[PDB]
Amino acid sequence: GADKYIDTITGFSCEKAAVTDNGFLVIAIDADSDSGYDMLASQFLEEAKKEGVSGLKGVLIVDIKNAKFEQGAVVGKRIGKAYK
């Protein structure tokens, strides 16, 4: 699963992250803008796969300042995205 990867990037290259039930890796950053982070999403997706995280549909970037992490889901505007 993704726990080891998440535990390596948390507080390193993002503030919080989680895999959601629908198969996305959601990464929360201290964003200055409310859109435009697709390139970051693609870099994270590539890195997650390089570190052996399987089964991801994609990476979603959200702003730590407004996202709400719940069990199995993250609520908030996606400020960047990348698909498998």
TrEMBL record:
Name assigned to this protein: BDI-0842-like domain-containing protein
Superkingdom, natural source: Bacteria
Domain BDI-0842-like: 2-84
